[PDB]
Design a binder for these strands. Structure first.
Lengths: 278, 278
DNA sequence: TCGACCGGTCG
DNA sequence: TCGACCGGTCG
């Protein structure tokens, strides 16, 4: 569909939403809008739940576009009683973690693998079990990966730590922060995964609102892409922006950027975890 | 004076702005407002120069409060044709660099010391002369420090690099971005100074707008104070928030947080550079 | 250009 | 809690 946007009159623009019909957009909006200001529903849950829903409604759409052009722009328009943009910052980062855990845990459960979002209070013990407590940048690990009957420092249910996920909606941040603790974890035989929506579009005046992300190409890498393909500073990177350029069949480091949708069951991400941990 | 802050939509809040009169406030406003949208004037220069002006008009006022409760607020109200908050993000960081250089270079010149803000196009050579180019994270340094007849790789006038400043209006967890660069610099025998306005106030409904900063106290440290006093991640820290608690006489790392006003001639910062570089 | 600045939020 | 998320901007 053609999505029409108003940025504060008379600045108006439009952008194409591939594989999203008007009715499908309406469907997603009808689900999401009531949740945005629902009392006692954390917006990380509202957004996370709506993203899982939206990618099921539009399994052929660019998931990053659903996040950026649909959920983001609707949230900004609809959020009440608090600054929409800064609310979005605070709630959407954790929302992505929520969506990851919700989307993947039922598929991973069959394999004894479990993701846990390290919200306030969960991180310290997790980082300790990961062997990177009080290491600079370790706080950038957002989701713990555990496997029953394996891993470091198993809990009472037998789940031990086998990796961590650095979850980032977008990549403007200093990702070099992440590297030392990531390398330490990789050295311990733990998975260190960068999971991202790779969101970035440039708005009017002179931007065309196409959500191309920030990872460049193998032929012309951004510094971020160099971290993965060149330096090998993560075990793998998964981007849910269909416009993200995937790695070549081979990379200098052997580490790859993988690109995928967010709908369905077993995907490149689940099969990656399962194969790594089997 | 009592400041009246327009939070929009008929919402008003108040905060006390010590050692600023209504008349001094108007003087600052009269200088700064016409600069906010002035053609051909970068806002980093508008804000930077207005800060130097404001601290000279109100030398007993809390510099951090002048930045946060006056310049920020006026900028947000007055900026035309572009999102005020995001414009402020993009321009105010560089503005603090501008202000540091403007305020300190006259006094430092008497001792053959010179600051230079590392704006676009300048960083590559500066890092090379520092001996830290192409190291992971080393780009996160803002203002270089040079000494005539000292330092490394002297320029045409004999000024060699002796260190750098990590300049931050506010710390949040963004100061963690500076830690790997800082450790690398100190490892190469360079001065690595954290200079900050230590801005943080909690606006209603989240607090009382008092700009207490994010460094806690020696008895009750924030994680940021631990970076400095515990881990020794910087050569020294200089805060221009009069509410920042200075370090005790001794710290575990031997590194200290110093606190001062901004306007003046010689101060703890210049004394520090002169002593370190003599 | 397009990399990287900051702060209200809310848990 | 007091930590720390993200994106329009602009040089």
């Amino acid at each position: 569909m053609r999505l029409d946007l108003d940025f504060g009159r008379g600045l108006v623009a439009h952008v194409m939403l591939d594989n999203v019909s008007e009715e499908q957009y309406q469907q997603i909006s009808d689900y999401f809008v009531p949740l945005v200001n629902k009392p006692k529903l954390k917006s990380r849950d509202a957004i996370g739940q709506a993203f899982v829903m939206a990618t099921e409604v539009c399994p052929d759409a660019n998931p990053s576009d659903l996040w950026h052009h649909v959920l983001y722009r609707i949230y900004i328009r609809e959020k009440i009683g608090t600054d929409p943009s800064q609310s979005w910052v605070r709630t959407s980062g954790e929302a992505f973690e929520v969506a990851l855990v919700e989307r993947y845990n039922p598929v991973l459960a069959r394999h004894g693998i479990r993701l846990t979002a390290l919200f306030k209070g969960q991180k310290g013990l997790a980082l300790t079990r990961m062997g990177v407590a009080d290491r600079v940048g370790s706080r950038k690990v957002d989701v713990m990966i555990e496997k029953q009957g394996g891993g470091r420092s198993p809990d009472a249910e037998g789940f031990g730590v086998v990796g961590g996920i650095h979850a980032k909606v977008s990549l403007a941040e200093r990702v070099s922060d992440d590297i030392p603790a990531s390398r330490i974890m990789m050295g311990e035989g733990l998975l260190s995964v960068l999971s991202t929506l790779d969101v970035k579009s440039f708005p009017p005046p002179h931007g065309d609102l196409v959500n191309r992300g920030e990872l460049g190409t193998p032929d012309r890498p951004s510094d971020k892409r160099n971290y993965i393909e060149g330096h090998g500073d993560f075990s793998a990177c998964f981007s849910y922006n269909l416009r993200t350029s995937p790695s070549n069949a081979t990379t200098p480091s052997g580490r790859h950027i993988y690109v995928s949708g967010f709908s369905g069951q077993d995907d490149e991400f689940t099969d990656y975890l399962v194969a790594q941990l089997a």
